[PDB]
């Protein structure tokens with residue numbers, strides 16, 4: 001009978017169609033919307049590119065492989081198929097690594113990486129990923145039968161020769177899947193917790209500013225980098241003494257772009273830990289929303305834990321949601337008189353709720369990473385765990401389970417473009433305007 005084989009093959013063909021029309025919709029949408037011409041979208045573009053080539057070639061040739069239960073198109077066809085397949089998938093997981101380190105460096109490195117990232121740099125990183133994936137797999141497959149001497153793969157099958165042993169296969173699974181997964185997992189949980197601090201920075205870049213030399217605040221106080229007050233005394237000799245105390249060497253005045261970035265984070269974390277430690281700042285910080293929190297930090301980042309602890313009547317109104325009543329309550333202080341230009345933008349935040357005074361695009365959690373990673377894990381885990389199982393025995397895993405797990409790794413490339421439309425609304429309207 002085996003008509004179910006033809007039926008299932010048609011389903012996989014349908015699945016392959018959904019994959020290729022889903023990925024080409026992403027490619028087209030990116031090149032016609034103009035509003036999606038950002039860096040992170042270009043990473044999703046290449047991810048869609050890798051899913052496209054693996055959804056138009058790999059899924060089709062594997063369908064015929066399980067259909068006729070053999071490989072009857074020579075050895076070169078099998079070698080080139082597995083090469084392109086593995087490279088594309090390895091470029092896919094490296095791309096996921098790129099995205100993971102992308103918006104993580106956008107957090108930890110506001111100046112080194114975040115303030116220096118173009119579409120050209122993205123193409124280099126992606127291009128580098130494909131080159132690495134190429135060198136790792138393509139010569140390893142092709143030039144292996146020309147290395148040992150004779151081909152192990154018999155006419156009628158199609159697999160990898162240097163993955164004969166289950167030990168070397170499991171080792172590759174660790175270094176190419178388990179290791180990237182744990183990293184992306186660690187990074188993601190260090191993004192979801194540290195996404196609120198990204199916008200905390202842009203406020204301090206407007207108020208305090210950025211400079212490598214040593215200047216003076218809106219009152220004549222020595223400060224280097226991003227709002228880091230070295231000292232309060234009008235003496236330059238002792239000002240640099242505190243500067244070199246934070247760096248580690250004789251800067252003789254000026255610093256670099258990475259040093260200023262480092263000294264910035266040392267004062268922000270000290271402020272936040274200065275809020276939680278303080279008995280009059282901790283309940284206030286926990287009574288405000290995540291958006292109103294950076295505004296409070298801006299006060300602590302400047303005045304200090306003590307300076308903000310001197311506003312008793314003010315902190316009481318913040319907890320009691322007396323925003324407009326606290327807006328005028330903060331307009332009667334030395335801070336509002338000495339450096340008033342920035343105070344107008346801080347107080348406005350406490351009475352409205354949004355940062356329309358500072359403008360700045362809002363950034364909340366990782367809306368894209370959660371979908372694509374969970375999809376990537378759930379789909380590929382039944383295969384890699386099966387490799388772990390296959391390692392400690394032989395006939396413990398049937399060929400059917402290998403084919404299914406191989407297909408589960410294929411639907412990963414199918415769900416990935418669907419994850420794009422199941423998140424951002426800009427991708428939604430662009431997938432809707434198309435096709436008409």
Ligand SMILES: C[N+]1(C)[C@@H]2C[C@@H](OC(=O)C(O)(c3cccs3)c3cccs3)C[C@H]1[C@@H]1O[C@@H]12
Pocket residue numbers: 085086089090093163169170172173174176177380383384387406409410
């Ligand atoms: C979807 N794939 C195309 C197929 C199944 C998956 O296989 C895996 O997840 C593996 O750990 C292994 C494949 C083979 C031995 S260990 C990876 C390989 C490369 C990057 S991760 C991922 C890729 C890989 O080509 C196979």
